[PDB]
């Protein structure tokens, strides 16, 4: 048993390093160069990695894991027993691989055209319309057009995708794909834990929602906003209304305290995508954390190519499983939003670099939420008016009015995201368990959009619509609950790191730049990779083991007080009791 187990793990690790590296190369080549040739080569490398996964997975299942002495070895073998998609018979596997490729390509190439006129891509064109347009009809054209072209096109693939991903999950001992995905957390209480955290953020979200709804009523008119109903989904400055910070101009608490056009500041000062990533790299090293290798700068795709290549523009970070080659792929735009995204992606890279010496099976975050949180933690400090001023992107600080303005800007991103990030996998888990059929995909999506976010579609949906498909993570088959987890725990990390850095005063005023004490907490946790259950890494960072909304609540407490006073004086009804309302 124990000698065979150790040898197996050693053999698994050295062979996986080679196969995964080769696969990552082909995957990268496709993602940064969408052609028939790179598609063919990718689909072929799929079969190579599946061969390897089957070989070692079949072998791993011969071990009685719960009868093994060593913890690290037992944990590796348990994981290898899960073949994931390689559990599918050859015919279903090739079909599944092709479906995944087809969905990603469809989404990444979709355009929205005026007749006899120009065609708009999602990045940057439609994103910019959603962020900057203040015309109801122009916002609707982009919102609907994007769903018409990307969402509807995904529908033909989705039922078969569901069938095949569920089949793979069952062949690996799970009840469905949702079961398989949730198991990434190793937390039996997950669904209830997440529900409790969501409920805790309700007073803050409802108050933000009511305040923003009033400001939209002001701008877009009484005929288009029901002050007791859900908010039309196209008015929040973002394609998915998942973050609302682009309508800051419509909702400024104290318009007498003006803040700098940060984008114009970045453009004027000649900021480029490369500069944005260099500044992120500097923040990590200021903490005593690792710099990205010279290779990163050579091989990364940090901006949309202009040589005619079709690419997957959605930001992502890549581990090539050799401990040397790490890359980011991002169609970076020069603005504050993408500066935050650059930091998020550099957090993934930092995690890769930190756990690079673990066996490849353990080269994952403590849970998927941890991997998402790292970059966002640093970005919280980056976002402070004090720090932005030090980058010469803001002029100031430290009036109460500028303070509530700052908290509002942060809430529009961080608070608004809470119900959306909770909502995506509530929908998918119910698709995977068979409670939502292909007949009810869209209707149940909107039911949840209403229930959790208090949003309504600006135009009634019809048969053939598949709005979930217009969101990257759906055709791309990337689990989403990690983002909800991330947003809760990143505030816990911020609080702990700030304490470790000797910050006193309001949490939202903390900037951990150059804190070696903060860097050390992060490094120790990240080095664990997936080697221990996640509460150990939580414990290392925060001095306790639990997920908790208390840090986020504390961060936003002065804003909650302000919102309650403001909403009360205008007599807002919190929530959307007129829930059937649409515009
Ligand atoms: C359970 O098994 C794990 C895994 O073991 C490893 O993989 C197996 C498949 C097999 O190949 C086996 O031989 C191999 O060890 C054990 O985890 C390892 O534990 C050791 C000792 O704790 C770790 O050794 C460190 O190695 C790293 C570099 O690889 C060094 O940084 C470090 O070097 C020194 O540390 C000492 C501290 O005493 C200092 O004096 C020095 O300054 C220097 O820093 C260690 O030598 C090793 O990293 C672990 N490997 C993995 C993969 O986790 C584990 O010990 C076993 N547990 C039990 C209960 O036996
Ligand atoms: C894009 O992919 C094609 C395969 O069709 C390849 O020939 C070409 O070299 C690639 N271009 C770049 C920029 O690498
Ligand atoms: Cl939608
Ligand atoms: Cl996840
Ligand atoms: Zn991420």
From Swiss-Prot:
Residues recorded as binding chloride 2, renumbered to this chain, are: 147, 445, 449
What does the entry say induces or represses the expression of this protein? Up-regulated in failing heart.
Question: What Gene Ontology biological process does one annotation of this record name?
Answer: regulation of heart rate by cardiac conduction
Q: What is the effect of changing residue 372 to V?
A: Abolished dipeptidyl carboxypeptidase activity
Note the effect listed for residue 521 to Q.
Answer: Does not prevent cleavage and secretion of the soluble form, suggesting that processing can take place at different sites
Where are the glycosylation sites?
33, 51, 70, 116, 298, 546
For the ligand (chloride 3), the binding residues are 185, 482
The UniProt site entry described as Cleavage is assigned to 521-522
- Coiled-coil ranges per UniProt: none
Chief location = membrane
| Entry binding sites for Zn(2+) 2 | 344, 348, 372
Q: Name one GO molecular function term.
A: peptidyl-dipeptidase activity
PTM annotation: Phosphorylated on tyrosine residues on its extracellular part, promoting cleavage by secretase enzymes and formation of the soluble form (Angiotensin-converting enzyme, soluble form).
The observed outcome of changing residue 471 to A is: Decreased ability to cleave substance P and bradykinin. Reduced binding to captopril inhibitor
User: Which Gene Ontology cellular component terms are annotated?
Assistant: endosome; external side of plasma membrane; extracellular exosome; extracellular region; extracellular space; lysosome; plasma membrane
Described function: Dipeptidyl carboxypeptidase that removes dipeptides from the C-terminus of a variety of circulating hormones, such as angiotensin I, bradykinin or enkephalins, thereby playing a key role in the regulation of blood pressure, electrolyte homeostasis or synaptic plasticity. Composed of two similar catalytic domains, each possessing a functional active site, with different selectivity for substrates.
As for family, the record states: Belongs to the peptidase M2 family.
Identify the disorder associated with this protein.
Ischemic stroke: A stroke is an acute neurologic event leading to death of neural tissue of the brain and resulting in loss of motor, sensory and/or cognitive function. Ischemic strokes, resulting from vascular occlusion, is considered to be a highly complex disease consisting of a group of heterogeneous disorders with multiple genetic and environmental risk factors.
Q: What protein is this chain from?
A: Angiotensin-converting enzyme
- This chain's source organism reads Homo sapiens (Human)
What gene name is given for the protein in this entry? ACE
